[PDB]
Design a binder for this molecule. Structure first.
Ligand SMILES: CCCCNC(=O)[C@H](C)C[C@H](O)[C@@H]1CSC/C=C/CS[C@H]2CCCN[C@H]2C(=O)N[C@@H](C)C(=O)N1
Length: 375
């Protein structure tokens, strides 16, 4: 019955992907950012320059105050608000209504984005990273406890809408086989990267470096984010491969955007990136390959040029690897919480390089994969 959920997401990589939800009685409609990197369901509940609408607890007969405050910091942005519960539904999701925890956001900093068209956030990860603590049941945990919806969801983010299939896998959204990697621990959607190659060349780092201090799958982050040492090794490699042309160093910091005459972008000089993920059987892994069309994010020209301009969508991290939206775009990603694994497959909405193709390939053999986990 998943066909009704296809295309239930709007938005872009750089603006966030959001789904429509309703809260309260009578139902109030809000667009909610879908975020696998956190575990709090929160909505603007007070006026804000960037909000065209918000949650009004006074208008809902089913609202219940929990008389407790809450604060949530992200890599960027933060808000504080008031905990309560209310009835929640997803119009283009399963046909159910659940009582869910909701943080009513009363104050925020660098959280809401001007003209993003969303007014809240849906944290899809586990209770362990919920604020104020893990006793605040996350939305998806509530959905699964209160209804018959199976304990999984999948995401198909399409670059330049998407689909969130709640409760299953829709086989028409991907081609080829699904490959699965264990969820290392149920807090973030944490996985283990066991090898990295660039244009077929092994970075040859201690694989612990790739997962220092963790690696997570996050639909709510735009970029691929890498630990300092890995980020430096990657950028060095990508520079050398594209040394044909000259780029400002502010470009490699994701600040300045480079441009080319419409339809003349030299994709071929940028390397593919292969991330190998721990697999499901002993000494086995598989790889996802990223095309430049993914880590060069298209942006509006700062001038009156009909040129194609891009930003470098790989950035340095001090909190581990983040596989963000630009990586998830062009894969179908299955968050199989029931079997503690995450699946990847080539998306039906993948980008078309002329001579290269984004791919999910296996099996590969990799000795000692356990040693790649950071402790
Ligand atoms: C409370 C413990 C869990 C905290 N989890 C995290 O911080 C995750 C690692 C990151 C989150 O997934 C977090 C959720 S979105 C918060 C809004 C930012 C405005 S910018 C945000 C929305 C527009 C598109 N770019 C996005 C982005 O790129 N956000 C990164 C920068 C980020 O921060 N994402």
């Amino acid at each position: 019955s998943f066909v009704e959920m296809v295309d239930n997401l709007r938005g872009k990589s750089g603006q966030g992907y959001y789904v429509e939800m309703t809260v309260g009685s009578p139902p109030q409609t809000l667009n909610i950012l879908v975020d696998t990197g956190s575990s709090n369901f929160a909505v603007g509940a007070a006026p804000h320059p960037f909000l065209h609408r918000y949650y009004q607890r006074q208008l809902s007969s089913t609202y219940r105050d929990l008389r407790k405050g809450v604060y949530v910091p992200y890599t960027q942005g933060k808000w504080e608000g008031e905990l309560g519960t209310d009835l929640v539904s997803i119009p283009h999701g399963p046909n159910v209504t659940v009582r869910a925890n909701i943080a009513a956001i009363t104050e925020s900093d660098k959280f809401f984005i001007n003209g993003s068209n969303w007014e809240g956030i849906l944290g899809l990860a586990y209770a362990e990273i919920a604020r104020p603590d893990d006793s605040l049941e996350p939305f998806f945990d509530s959905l699964v406890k209160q209804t018959h919806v199976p304990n999984l969801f999948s995401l198909q983010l399409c670059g330049a809408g998407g689909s969130m299939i709640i409760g299953g896998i829709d086989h028409s959204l991907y081609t080829g086989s699904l490959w699965y990697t264990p969820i290392r621990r149920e807090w973030y959607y944490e996985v283990i990267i066991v090898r990295v190659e660039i244009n077929g060349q092994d970075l040859k780092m201690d694989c612990k470096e790739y997962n220092y201090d963790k690696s997570i799958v996050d639909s709510g982050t735009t970029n691929l984010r890498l630990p300092k040492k890995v980020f430096e090794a990657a950028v060095k490699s990508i520079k050398a491969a594209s040394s044909t042309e000259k780029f400002p160093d502010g470009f490699w910091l994701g600040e300045q955007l480079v441009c080319w005459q419409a339809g003349t972008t030299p994709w071929n000089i940028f390397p593919v990136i292969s991330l190998y993920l721990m697999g499901e059987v002993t000494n086995q892994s598989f790889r996802i390959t990223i095309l430049p069309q993914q880590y060069l994010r298209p942006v509006e020209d700062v001038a009156t040029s009909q040129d194609d301009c891009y930003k470098f969508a790989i950035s340095q991290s001090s909190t581990g690897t983040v596989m963000g939206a630009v990586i998830m775009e062009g894969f179908y990603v299955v968050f199989d919480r029931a079997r503690k694994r995450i699946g990847f497959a080539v998306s039906a909405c993948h980008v078309h390089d002329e001579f290269r193709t984004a791919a999910v390939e296996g099996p590969f053999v990799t000795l000692d994969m356990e040693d790649c986990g950071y402790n």
